[PDB]
Design a protein around this nucleic acid. Sequence first.
RNA 1: GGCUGAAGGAUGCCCAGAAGGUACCCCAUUGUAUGGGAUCUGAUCUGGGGCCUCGGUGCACAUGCAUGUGUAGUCGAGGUUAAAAAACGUCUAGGCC
Length: 238
Amino acid sequence: GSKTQDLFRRVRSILNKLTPQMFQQLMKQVTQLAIDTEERLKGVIDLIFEKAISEPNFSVAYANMCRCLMALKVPTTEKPTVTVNFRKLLLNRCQKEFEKDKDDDEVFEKKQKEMDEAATAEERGRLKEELEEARDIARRRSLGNIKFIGELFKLKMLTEAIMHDCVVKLLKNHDEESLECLCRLLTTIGKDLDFEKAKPRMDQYFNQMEKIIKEKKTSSRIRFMLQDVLDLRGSNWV
RNA sequence: GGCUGAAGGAUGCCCAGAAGGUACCCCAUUGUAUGGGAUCUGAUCUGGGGCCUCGGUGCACAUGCAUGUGUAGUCGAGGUUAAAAAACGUCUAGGCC
Ligand SMILES: [Mg+2]
Ligand SMILES: [Mg+2]
Ligand SMILES: [Mg+2]
């Protein structure tokens, strides 16, 4: 049983040491890891996903690390005649994280009543600090998940269609968190998405947020980041 | 009681179909929302796909270095079916001790 925990230790060590420049030298270590059980694979994917969405800066490296294990079949423990590819498991974690928003507010609502139940000023302030801290923890996760999906797109483990139905989903929910994520995703995938096969559809995305830019109904910071994204588009994504 | 491995399943690729999505467009309510349609898709499921024909090279054989024959998971060259695939970070049926 110590073998699974030792594999987790080595995977976490590699993730901590992983950096863009020294990438290649650690990849041999990644290919030499004995991942042969659905539990080990799920745990390694859990570690990679958590690190990649909790720390967006180095997510690029982690994305490329995932490319080195795009083909790592393992037999499902329940029915040992079935197999699960690493890609199927890593993408399921990504898609599940992407659509938690539908339920996300719910848990805050489940805590929102407590805001009323904290009678005294000390309790009210402590409850308010905890709820906004939770809101920060969630918005930091969603942004990490979006940048990780965008980084996996540049390595072709995804396709243009998932980005085109992720951008439109973020944009249809005109709430602040979604528009911040839309800014991050377009900023990280604009050059690899601005092609002539997607020229018509893209020509509406920005146009839509242009109205947002002109409406000034949302918070300023959102407009500010949208202006940055539109200006980066105007300069050929560089 | 231990070693090994079938293009038999599974995985990957390709094709068909389905759930789902679909900014823009159109139709209805009509409210910029919902529902339906049209493309475009399809992170997900259900199936199907391991064809021919000809050369080069290599190999083996059989005849007199040459010719004929068969073909190496061979390189190409073309056809055919909607589809001509990772000889596969996998499980088995076995096979051996
Ligand atoms: Mg449909
Ligand atoms: Mg199939
Ligand atoms: Mg089949």
